[PDB]
Amino acid sequence: FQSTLVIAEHANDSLAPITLNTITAATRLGGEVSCLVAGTKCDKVAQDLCKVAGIAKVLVAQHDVYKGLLPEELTPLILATQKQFNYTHICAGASAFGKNLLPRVAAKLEVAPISDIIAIKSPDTFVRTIYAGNALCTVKCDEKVKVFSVRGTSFDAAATSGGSASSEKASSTSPVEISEWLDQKLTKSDRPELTGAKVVVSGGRGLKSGENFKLLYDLADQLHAAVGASRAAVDAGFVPNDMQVGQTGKIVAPELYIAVGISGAIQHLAGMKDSKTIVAINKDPEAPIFQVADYGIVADLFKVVPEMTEILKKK
Amino acid sequence: LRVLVAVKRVIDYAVKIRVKPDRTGVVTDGVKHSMNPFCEIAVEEAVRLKEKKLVKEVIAVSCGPAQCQETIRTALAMGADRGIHVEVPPAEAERLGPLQVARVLAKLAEKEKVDLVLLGKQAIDDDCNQTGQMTAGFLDWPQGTFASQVTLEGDKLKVERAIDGGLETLRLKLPAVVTADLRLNEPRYATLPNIMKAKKKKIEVIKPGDLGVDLTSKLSVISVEDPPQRTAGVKVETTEDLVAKLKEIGRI
Ligand SMILES: Cc1cc2nc3c(=O)[nH]c(=O)nc-3n(C[C@H](O)[C@H](O)[C@H](O)COP(=O)(O)OP(=O)(O)OC[C@H]3O[C@@H](n4cnc5c(N)ncnc54)[C@H](O)[C@@H]3O)c2cc1C
Ligand SMILES: Nc1ncnc2c1ncn2[C@@H]1O[C@H](COP(=O)(O)O)[C@@H](O)[C@H]1O
Incomplete structure (x- = not known):
């Protein structure tokens, strides 16, 4: 018993x-x-x-x-x-x-x-x-x-x-x-809580700025997704620490995880690698993230993300 | 004030680990080892406390086999004052967990009359995130875990901690235990002068038995295995195609 x-x-x-x-x-x-x-x-x-x-x-x-x-x-x-x-x-x-x-x-x-x-x-x-x-x-x-x-x-x-x-x-x-x-x-927002969210959009160092991170909020908005971050994004001040995904941050396993300008370091993969569908948006075809992504586009996130957002506004 | 900092030797973070064919654990012989990154943050904070002239003495401790001395030597180079190596034979170091480490630390904390025990919030190998909490528990001391800021306030500690929704702030009565989040600080580089200096600094060797700590364990590794394999999926040419695919599989 x-x-x-x-x-x-x-x-x-x-x-x-x-x-x-x-x-x-x-x-x-x-x-x-x-x-x-x-x-x-x-x-x-x-x-x-x-x-x-x-x-x-x-x-x-x-x-x-x-x-x-x-x-x-x-x-x-x-x-x-x-x-x-x-x-x-x-x-x-x-x-x-x-x-x-x-x-x-x-x-x-x-x-x-x-x-x-x-x-x-x-x-x-x-x-x-x-x-x-x-x-x-x-x-x-x-x-x-x-x-x-x-x-x-x-x-x-x-x-x-x-x-x-x-x-x-x-x-x-x-x-x-x-x-x-x-x-x-x-940290309070309109977004669903990161660890239970069905869809997560995450930004890493490729976003270059906290202002650029708004691109990810706009995309997330169309998907009703939470927004995660790599350590590089947190350290460079783009986003608060509590949105960090990985070994030292939150573990998430959404239905859809979209990794934008994130290389896919071991420590980031620790926190999202059991996501059902992994999408990578990254300009480097050698990025480790591409070795776990179900779907990947090797392109500039500054083009892809805004585009995705506009497409999603329709159907 | 006197500080005890616990530092762990672990396989270096950038290493691709290999599981043993016998399934008993991962390969460690011949593999690059270094100070656990969270431990490094704990040493840097202890040293910053000394530099603020709020701490008189920083004692670095590692539990395990001979090579832990290097980890202690590193802490000493970063600015710790003296070291203690709680020596455990390689075979028994494999059975060594947070419970055992926490018992050792609690005994040393009392023995060496320390006011604050600093640890990393977790070891990147066992990923336990247990030792600091357990150490606090054995000592009946307050704990400030996942610290991103520490402020000594006379006989009290104000600690900002990382929590799921953001941050929170606590005040702990000293003596206290604190475990360091990665946000806490940026560890310094140990220069060659500092490293040569650290060779003068003392390390004491003791055995857990010397502290009245018994290593008997009711936990046991049945097996260690690779997780399922997951390799490259597909490339798409356009954003339209990416959105099309995600819609047709029902993820958008
Ligand atoms: C103890 C420890 C714990 C850690 N825990 C975590 C953790 O929990 N989570 C975490 O994330 N990290 C963690 N890290 C840090 C981790 O090792 C990496 O340093 C971090 O994940 C890298 O973040 P990044 O992918 O954003 O940066 P980078 O590795 O620099 O990757 C940036 C990517 O952006 C791409 N890029 C740049 N510009 C564009 C563009 N215009 N369009 C498209 N792509 C572009 C590049 O191709 C590159 O792949 C930890 C490290 C340590 C030592
Ligand atoms: N063998 C060890 N020797 C010294 N300190 C340790 C040891 N194992 C764990 N610790 C301390 O406890 C923290 C968390 O370890 P863990 O609870 O294993 O995740 C580490 O960052 C260390 O500061």
């Missing part, structure tokens, strides 16, 4: 879509699935999770101590929950939230955790990537508790209706107060 606790990711009273993919991973274990919602405002998220397919039990921890989801505060909450209900597995999507939290929890449980898994073969056996996605590592975990984060793009989202989980309040915990959340600066 496996019993899994999924830590819900949410911000601004909205459930992060990656928790839904994480619930799916959790169903691979054939047992009971619980979901813990900790935060300052948890009613809508909790209510919503009680309609998600695959969840038996929702646990709700509403307290002001959880403002900004500090892992110094969440970890005791999770250890208290584990003590009471003795899960075999604790997991979360391998977002920044999940990458931040789970290894601390594993430390406190004194177990070796597993990162960014792409498959569950059995309750103790997991597949993950290493060397920037260039090798598949199959790991066996004999720990009393298996603590793991899940590659969101490797598992389908659980339906947001049809669930009938129970809801119960969790153990409130005493303020640790060794960290404090001060503020945030979020």
